[PDB]
Design a protein around this ligand. Structure first.
Ligand SMILES: O=c1ccn([C@@H]2O[C@H](COP(=O)(O)OP(=O)(O)O)[C@@H](O)[C@H]2O)c(=O)[nH]1
Ligand SMILES: O=c1ccn([C@@H]2O[C@H](COP(=O)(O)OP(=O)(O)O)[C@@H](O)[C@H]2O)c(=O)[nH]1
Lengths: 212, 209
């Protein structure tokens, strides 16, 4: 059964073409998942499943749509009883030997217990905090005053075990409106300390986002 | 009035002596703050000021004590009406020319508004999440399976504005939102509107093991 899903706006035909080119050349099976966008469909899904998120002013409707798309795919993993599901966003660029990882799953089956709770990142690791130089505040005694700025972890390419799909669905349902944060922050920052939940990183990675 | 406080367990004589040698070597005034350790004192302070932290199973009592020590120093900043306070942990090494930064404040006064909300890190910048190798799960096609694993609160200046902000922030955090103090101050909260975290580069102190 197919394990690879690419989140893509149903009208984003040029992005879909980019995905098709890359995946078909490497003979990697996949399906598109129609992404949630600002719409009655997204609004109704938020109210049905995540009214906490519907009420969260701290997320943009785009960020809510992104969360909803991942969340519905986590649900798909559970509903179809998949050992794992592999999720992409439609701006990823695949590295050369992606087929060995994405067209076959026996390597995962040997390495992981899917009722255990893990996410394996396939995309490049991005530092969530970086130093930026600035101009307003002058240096002192030959030391610069830099600013700490936050960067989002990508959610553009990862494997999630059925265990983790269940965990993240329950987590997002249990969060209060005030506790909601963008999906990348919950998956890859906040929850890194959580006891049974483990995040792994393929290194070197096998894909990267085409944006920034 | 003194601005430099070094958080240190009252019985940690060896650490205290190392701090004394380092600060006095550069004629930097400081005072020790007796760190909270597992005790009735810590328990009662948690209940009085941070009951959501008392209930947070995800922190060790040591991590709770560390948070409590910083929190009480933020309070000290407010109570003594200090423009800023400079907080250290007791396992640090001071760099050269630290006196210009730590025994004098005019450089801060001309660069910052103390009623505004900032923290200036004095300790070396460390990546708050690292890739750790592991041995149990074999690599595949020359790619390792690493674990993502978790900044340092061993050296920073905080404005009175930020002391107020952080006291209120930590009091408002839910049990679910509680994390070790360094994860809040220097990771989670970097995404926050009026809260600005700066980094001296190169830094003027570094943490020892
Ligand atoms: O309303 C939206 C917009 C985008 N996405 C998805 O989020 C991913 C990243 O989107 P993009 O790089 O275009 O940034 P965004 O538009 O989300 O800010 C892509 O898979 C999009 O299909 C979504 O689910 N809902
Ligand atoms: O119960 C404790 C333990 C440590 N610390 C302080 O936290 C800093 C870091 O101490 P250490 O590196 O020993 O941390 P630990 O190993 O206790 O987690 C030092 O300034 C300690 O005095 C504290 O306030 N309470």
């Amino acid at each position: 059964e197919n394990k690879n899903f690419v989140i893509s706006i149903s009208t984003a035909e040029q992005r879909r073409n980019h995905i098709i080119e890359q995946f078909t050349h490497q003979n990697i099976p996949f399906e598109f998942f129609d992404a949630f966008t600002p719409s009655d469909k997204l609004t109704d899904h938020l109210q049905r499943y995540l009214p906490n998120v519907a009420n969260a002013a701290q997320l943009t409707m785009g960020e809510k749509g992104c969360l909803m798309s991942h969340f519905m795919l986590w649900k798909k993993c559970i509903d179809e009883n998949l050992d794992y599901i592999t999720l992409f966003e439609d701006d990823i660029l695949l590295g050369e030997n992606a087929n060995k990882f994405l067209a076959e799953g026996d390597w995962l089956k040997v390495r992981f217990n899917f009722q255990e709770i893990f996410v394996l990142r396939l995309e490049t690791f991005l530092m969530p905090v970086q130093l930026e130089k600035q101009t307003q505040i002058p240096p002192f005694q030959q030391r610069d005053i830099d600013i700490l700025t936050s960067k989002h972890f990508g959610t553009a390419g990862y494997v999630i075990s059925q265990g983790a799909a269940k965990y993240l669905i329950a987590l997002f349902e249990k969060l209060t409106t005030e506790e909601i944060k963008p999906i990348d922050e919950i998956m890859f920052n906040q929850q890194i300390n959580a006891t049974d939940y483990r995040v792994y990183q393929l290194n070197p990675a096998i894909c990267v986002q085409e944006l920034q």
